[PDB]
Every structure is written in C-alpha cells, then in structure tokens.
Amino acid sequence: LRQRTEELLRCNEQQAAELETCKEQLFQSNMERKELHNTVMDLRGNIRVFCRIRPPLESEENRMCCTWTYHDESTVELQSIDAQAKSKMGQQIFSFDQVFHPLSSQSDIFEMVSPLIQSALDGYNICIFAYGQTGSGKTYTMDGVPESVGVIPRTVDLLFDSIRGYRNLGWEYEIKATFLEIYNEVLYDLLSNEQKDMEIRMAKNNKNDIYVSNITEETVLDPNHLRHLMHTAKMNRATASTAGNERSSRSHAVTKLELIGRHAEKQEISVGSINLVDLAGSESPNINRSLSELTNVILALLQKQDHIPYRNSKLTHLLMPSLGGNSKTLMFINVSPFQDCFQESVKSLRFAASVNSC
Amino acid sequence: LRQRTEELLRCNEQQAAELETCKEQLFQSNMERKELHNTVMDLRGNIRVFCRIRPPLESEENRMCCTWTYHDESTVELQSIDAQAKSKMGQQIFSFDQVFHPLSSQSDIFEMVSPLIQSALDGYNICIFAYGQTGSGKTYTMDGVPESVGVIPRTVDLLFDSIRGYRNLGWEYEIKATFLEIYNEVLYDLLSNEQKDMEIRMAKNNKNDIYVSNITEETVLDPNHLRHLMHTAKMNRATASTAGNERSSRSHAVTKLELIGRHAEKQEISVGSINLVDLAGSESPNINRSLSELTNVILALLQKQDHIPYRNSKLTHLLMPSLGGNSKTLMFINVSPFQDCFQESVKSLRFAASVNSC
Ligand SMILES: Nc1ncnc2c1ncn2[C@@H]1O[C@H](COP(=O)(O)OP(=O)(O)O)[C@@H](O)[C@H]1O
Numbered sequence: 151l152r153q154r155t156e157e158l159l160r161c162n163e164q165q166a167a168e169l170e171t172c173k174e175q176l177f178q179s180n181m182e183r184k185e186l187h188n189t190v191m192d193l194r195g196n197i198r199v200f201c202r203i204r205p206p207l208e209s210e211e212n213r214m215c216c217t218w219t220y221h222d223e224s225t226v227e228l229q230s231i232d233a234q235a236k237s238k239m240g241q242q243i244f245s246f247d248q249v250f251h252p253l254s255s256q257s258d259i260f261e262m263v264s265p266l267i268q269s270a271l272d273g274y275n276i277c278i279f280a281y282g283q284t285g286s287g288k289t290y291t292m293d294g295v296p297e298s299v300g301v302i303p304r305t306v307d308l309l310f311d312s313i314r315g316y317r318n319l320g321w322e323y324e325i326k327a328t329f330l331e332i333y334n335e336v337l338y339d340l341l342s343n344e345q346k347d348m349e350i351r352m353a354k355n356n357k358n359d360i361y362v363s364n365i366t367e368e369t370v371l372d373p374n375h376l377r378h379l380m381h382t383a384k385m386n387r388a389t390a391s392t393a394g395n396e397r398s399s400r401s402h403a404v405t406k407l408e409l410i411g412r413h414a415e416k417q418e419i420s421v422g423s424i425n426l427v428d429l430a431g432s433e434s435p436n437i438n439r440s441l442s443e444l445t446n447v448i449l450a451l452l453q454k455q456d457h458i459p460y461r462n463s464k465l466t467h468l469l470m471p472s473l474g475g476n477s478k479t480l481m482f483i484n485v486s487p488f489q490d491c492f493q494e495s496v497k498s499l500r501f502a503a504s505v506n507s508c
Numbered sequence: 509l510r511q512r513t514e515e516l517l518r519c520n521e522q523q524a525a526e527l528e529t530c531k532e533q534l535f536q537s538n539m540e541r542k543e544l545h546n547t548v549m550d551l552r553g554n555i556r557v558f559c560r561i562r563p564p565l566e567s568e569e570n571r572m573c574c575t576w577t578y579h580d581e582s583t584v585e586l587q588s589i590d591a592q593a594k595s596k597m598g599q600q601i602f603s604f605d606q607v608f609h610p611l612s613s614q615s616d617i618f619e620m621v622s623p624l625i626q627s628a629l630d631g632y633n634i635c636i637f638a639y640g641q642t643g644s645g646k647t648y649t650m651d652g653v654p655e656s657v658g659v660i661p662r663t664v665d666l667l668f669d670s671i672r673g674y675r676n677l678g679w680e681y682e683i684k685a686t687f688l689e690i691y692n693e694v695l696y697d698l699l700s701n702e703q704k705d706m707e708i709r710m711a712k713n714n715k716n717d718i719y720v721s722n723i724t725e726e727t728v729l730d731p732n733h734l735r736h737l738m739h740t741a742k743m744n745r746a747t748a749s750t751a752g753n754e755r756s757s758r759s760h761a762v763t764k765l766e767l768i769g770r771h772a773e774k775q776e777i778s779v780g781s782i783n784l785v786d787l788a789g790s791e792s793p794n795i796n797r798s799l800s801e802l803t804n805v806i807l808a809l810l811q812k813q814d815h816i817p818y819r820n821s822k823l824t825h826l827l828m829p830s831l832g833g834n835s836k837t838l839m840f841i842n843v844s845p846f847q848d849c850f851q852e853s854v855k856s857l858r859f860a861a862s863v864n865s866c
C-alpha cells in the first residue's frame with residue numbers, strides 16, 4: 151500500500167499539471183475570441199444607425215399612412231399621399247445599416263443589440279439610443295410591452311445568461327445600475343423620491359471620466375432584483391401619459407449598466423458598460439439642448455472630428471466616456487407611418503441621411 | 509493509511525472531473541473563435557484583389573518608368589511619360605483591396621495571407637494567385653529569394669507553427685502535398701521525372717469534387733521535408749530561364765497543400781486546403797486558355813453568377829472545388845513600373861477594374 155498505491159499518487163501531479171495547461175489554453179482562446187468579436191464590430195460599424203417604422207395600432211385603423219417602399223434590407227422610401235406636395239419634393243429615399251419593417255419583431259431588433267452586450271462584457275462601452283417623434287416607437291422599442299418585451303428586458307436576461315457562462319472560465323461579474331431622467335437640462339434620480347442637486351462632475355481619479363453626484367447606485371444581486379429596479383424606475387419616470395406631455399415627451403431616460411468583470415487566479419479586471427437611452431421626442435415646438443447637442447456629437451463622431459464638444463449639454467456630457475474611441479453606438483430611428491407625420495418623418499430619416507453621408 | 513490517504517484518492521475524481529470541463533470549454537471556445545474568424549474573412553471579402561508594383565532592379569537603373577501616384581492605401585495611378593499619349597487617354601486610376609508600394613516588403617504581403625492559412629486549418633479551401641506580365645513580380649512574390657522569401661515558404665513555416673499549437677487542443681494535422689505545372693493545357697507532375705497522362709477527373713465518391721490521375725502525392729513528415737519537396741518541384745519546373753521562354757513564361761505552377769485535421773476524443777475530421785498558384789504571364793502574343801478562362805471564372809464568381817463554366821479549362825477545372833462558396837480567394841496583381849510596359853500594365857490593373865466594378 152506504499153509501493154502499490156503510488157499510482158493514485160503522482161496521478162494528481164499529472165492531473166493538476168494538465169488542468170493548468172487547459173486553463174491557460176482556454177484563457178488565451180477567450181482572448182482571441184474577444185479580439186475577433188471586436189474586429190467584427192469594428193468592421194460592421196461602431197456607430198450604426200437603424201430605421202424602424204412601426205405598424206398602425208388597432209385604434210388607428212382609420213389614420214391615413216403615406217406610401218412606403220422597402221428597398222432590400224437597408225433602404226426605405228416614403229411618398230406623401232398629398233399629390234400636390236409629392237410632385238414638388240422629389241424622392242424621399244434613405245439608407246441605414248438596417249431597416250426594420252413595421253412587421254419586424256422585438257426579437258428581430260435585439261439580434262442587432264445582443265452582439266454589443268458581449269462587447270460590454272469584454273470591457274467595451276456601449277450606447278443604445280432610441281430616436282424619433284413622440285409616438286414613433288421609442289419606448290416600445292426599449293421597454294416593450296408584456297407580451298413583447300423590448301431591448302432593455304432582453305439585455306438583462308442575456309446579460310445574466312452570459313455572466314453564468316463566464317463562471318466556468320474564471321471571471322466573476324458584478325453589475326452596478328443607475329437610472330436617471332433629463333428633462334430641462336436637470337437630472338433626476340429615478341431610484342429615489344428625495345431629489346438632490348445632481349451634477350455631472352469630472353471623475354476624481356481621471357480628468358477624462360465623469361460621475362454624477364447624488365444618484366442612487368445599486369449593485370445588482372440577480373436578474374429579478376434588476377427587473378425590480380427597472381420597474382421601479384419606469385414607474386418613477388411617470389412620463390406624463392395623463393396630462394402635460396410637455397415633460398414626458400420632452401425628457402430623456404438613461405439606464406446605465408456598469409459591467410465589472412473580475413478574474414482571480416490571473417489578476418486583471420475588466421470594466422465595461424451598457425447605456426440604454428430612451429430619448430426625448432424630436433418633433434418641433436433650453437428644453438431640448440441635450441437632444442440637439444447629441445445630434446451634433448454623433449454626427450461629429452461620424453466625421454472623425456478632432457474636437458467634440460461634449461460639455462455642450464447634460465446628456466452628451468454624461469455619455470462622453472461611453473462615446474469614446476473603442477465605444478460602440480447603436481442608434482434606432484423610430485418612425486410613424488402616418489401621412490400627418492410625413493414632415494416630422496423625413497426630418498428623422500434625414501438625420502440618418504447626415505449619417506451615411508459621412 | 510486507508511481513512512487517512514483518501515485525500516489523495518477522490519482527488520483525481522475531482523481533478524479529472526474538472527479537466528473534462530475545461531476541455532469541452534476550450535473546444536467550444538475554438539468553435540466560436542473559428543466562426544468569428546470566418547465572419548471577419550467574409551466581411552473583408554472572400555475574393556480580394558491586391559496590387560503590387562515592384563521596384564526596378566539594380567541592373568535596370570536606366571530603364572525608364574512611368575509616373576506613379578499612390579492614393580491612400582488602395583488606389584494607384586500611373587501616367588505614360590509619352591506626353592502625346594498621356595493627353596489622349598485620360599486618367600489611369602485603379603483601386604484594390606490593397607495596393608502594395610514597390611518598397612513594400614515580403615513580410616508586408618504575407619500579413620494579407622496569414623489569416624487565410626488559419627482558415628485552411630479550420631476546414632476552408634484557399635486559393636492564392638499571382639497575376640501579371642512576365643517580369644512583373646509573380647514568382648518573386650510566391651517563392652521569393654534567399655534573403656527575402658515569399659508567400660509559399662512563409663506559408664510552410666506558419667503552417668507547421670500553428671499545427672504545433674493545435675496539438676494542445678486535441679487535433680492532429682497531416683499535410684498532403686502535390687506540385688504540378690500546366691503549360692499547353694497539359695498537366696505535368698513536378699515531383700516525378702516519368703510523365704504519365706494526367707487528367708482531371710470527377711472524384712469517385714463526390715460528383716462535385718475532382719482528382720488528378722497520376723500525380724505524386726506526398727504526406728509531409730515535417731517542415732524540412734516540405735521544403736525539400738518544394739525545392740525539388742521548383743528545380744523541376746525548369747521554367748526556361750535560359751532559352752525558349754515560350755514555355756516558362758507561358759505555364760502555370762500550382763502547389764496544393766491539403767490540410768486534414770483529426771480530433772480523436774471528440775471524433776469529427778476537418779478538411780481544408782491551400783492552393784498557391786504562380787500563373788502564366790498575361791502579356792499578349794490554346795496556349796493560354798486556362799488563364800483566359802481563369803479570368804472569366806473569377807469575374808463570374810464576383811458577379812455571383814448562377815452558373816460558372818469551370819470545365820472550360822484545365823486550370824479552372826482543377827481549382828473548381830476550391831473556388832466554391834465558402835472558399836477564399838486572394839489574387840495578387842504583379843505590375844512592372846516601366847514605361848515600356850505601360851500598355852500591358854493598364855491591362856493588368858484593368859482586370860482589377862473589372863473586379864471592384866462588381
Ligand atoms: N412596433 C410596434 N408594434 C406594435 N405596437 C407598437 C409598435 N411600436 C409602437 N407601438 C405602440 O405605441 C406605443 C409606444 O410608444 P413610442 O411610440 O415608443 O414613444 P415616443 O415616440 O413618444 O418616444 C405603445 O403603447 C405600443 O402599443
């Protein structure tokens with residue numbers, strides 16, 4: 151039992167010596183996987199713009215829509231039904247990275263976002279924006295409805311799903327969540343009922359970063375806890391669905407999910423983040439500096455401008471660290487199919503016309 | 509030593525139970541890595557075309573060159589020094605996936621090929637072509653010279669280098685090498701000195717594949733053995749560097765490296781292949797059916813044509829299984845900088861003009 155059981159001895163020596171191999175092999179693999187995913191993201195865009203035309207609700211059966219033409223997968227055209235105007239404006243055709251048909255599904259739209267969730271997990275900053283005139287589809291796209299949840303809820307589910315997988319690869323993740331609203335260039339903490347003076351200040355240990363004073367920050371326990379935090383904030387956003395839409399339809403909602411990945415037994419951390427934004431309505435009548443300046447910032451980033459004026463508004467200043475270089479931005483342009491919206495519609499599609507144009 | 513050494517007992521049980529985990533984890537990783545690499549390849553092209561202008565040799569110090577302009581990294585322009593002609597043809601400007609300046613290095617050109625070597629290892633078929641008029645740079649690009657080796661030698665080194673890494677991931681690779689020459693629509697086995705009737709026939713167990721009768725096939729032992737097989741074939745290609753260039757400058761050299769990856773303890777094989785081709789000179793005076801038909805095939809593949817006439821020539825028929833769908837093609841357009849070559853030069857760059865044009 152000495153010169154007989156030595157077989158069940160160095161066996162561990164050979165075993166453990168083979169485990170460490172695989173381990174370092176797997177870690178280097180992930181490394182290469184991560185880098186390839188980013189090359190794909192970089193190749194696909196980094197700042198992409200999608201178009202989404204929503205279908206008419208049941209209660210709008212009698213609301214006239216203009217004529218829509220879907221050219222392939224990324225070009226859409228619309229023509230006023232006003233024969234007078236139509237023959238005085240000429241073709242209204244626009245292209246985007248992708249055009250989502252009114253019959254497209256919520257799942258259809260997440261297929262475009264999910265790859266970016268992985269990026270956040272790899273340490274990249276992501277920004278998802280929903281743009282458009284009040285009633286175009288912004289909130290339905292980000293939040294969705296019970297029988298058809300949108301981006302945010304799908305992000306939570308996928309996020310905790312990937313964090314699980316990461317467990318068997320070393321790496322443990324913590325999610326820090328904040329929820330805020332910007333209305334008239336003033337910030338509001340959607341997780342508190344006691345408002346304080348919230349300001350966007352220069353991070354203490356990084357002149358290039360930022361932090362918001364007096365915002366509630368919760369480190370998420372699990373999916374349900376985040377679902378609750380989200381429902382709480384949605385309920386506190388109390389966007390005037392009753393009276394005075396001048397504050398609901400005129401304010402931005404920003405949800406930030408800071409993702410911190412830690413890997414003990416190999417040191418090194420990984421800090422990423424997901425910024426989901428339900429923007430203020432873009433229709434025409436400060437109250438909309440942030441949205442105006444956000445438009446400038448995005449277009450500027452697209453024109454590879456040497457100097458971007460982020461501090462120009464509350465919203466751009468808040469997302470500055472997530473609009474950087476390696477940062478990835480996804481901008482959904484929500485649009486209504488109604489003729490009485492035509493004017494506001496080309497205005498929205500024209501933004502995307504300033505995008506691909508550069 | 510029974511209820512005391514049980515610690516060095518189930519330890520292996522826990523150990524081995526943890527190794528299998530990592531293993532399956534690593535295999536699935538590679539899987540994802542492989543798929544990402546292919547999405548990158550697909551996004552970059554699949555059939556790309558590069559341009560390479562060689563510098564004048566020392567013994568050509570007095571050979572007049574036309575004027576060359578390098579626009580960014582992928583657009584080149586040339587203007588005849590004949591003032592009469594220049595003002596009668598208009599701009600000669602072309603774009604490629606990448607333009608290699610006459611000062612570019614052999615390393616510079618391999619950076620474009622190496623990613624494709626990985627693809628072959630992942631089970632994809634790759635084709636590398638060197639195109640151009642006699643003296644433009646074809647052979648120097650593929651073979652190179654002692655102090656500056658080209659593509660082929662770099663492919664061998666990188667190939668055996670990656671095969672080594674694969675060892676610690678399961679997967680064992682065998683390399684099957686063949687070397688042939690096509691001159692007047694006749695095949696020649698470059699590893700034998702006893703010529704037989706070599707024909708391109710329909711593979712026995714796959715109406716869509718092919719095989720060449722009577723070609724020497726060697727399963728490579730190691731890098732040196734392949735280096736030898738290559739030097740043997742290069743020496744047998746005896747391309748008329750003496751007299752009658754009408755057979756050296758008029759024939760194609762094709763080197764195929766069939767890569768078979770086997771993974772015991774997970775079954776499943778992986779068959780890929782690398783086809784390195786030194787084409788026949790494209791200058792003007794059958795003797796060049798293969799090169800003419802190869803041009804048609806490539807352009808057709810680019811135009812996503814429903815039916816490609818591969819059997820139209822010996823060379824296209826031989827590469828048919830490696831010009832398929834998932835197949836990746838890289839075509840280098842070798843070009844001389846001399847004024848006395850101007851005519852043949854736009855002819856070469858114009859091929860690439862039919863490429864990006866579609
Ligand atoms: N794609 C769609 N499919 C079905 N209903 C939609 C769709 N898009 C929007 N809606 C509907 O209209 C409302 C969504 O508001 P939204 O247009 O997102 O806001 P705003 O444009 O003011 O930001 C929901 O009640 C929803 O039923």
Ligand SMILES: Nc1ncnc2c1ncn2[C@@H]1O[C@H](COP(=O)(O)OP(=O)(O)O)[C@@H](O)[C@H]1O
Pocket residue numbers: 561562563565610640641642643644645646647648649653757789842
């Ligand atoms: N990039 C280069 N740098 C230095 N010398 C070159 C270069 N390209 C071609 N050459 C030279 O000219 C010869 C190569 O032949 P090549 O032009 O490849 O053949 P063909 O165009 O007839 O297929 C070599 O002897 C080499 O010295």
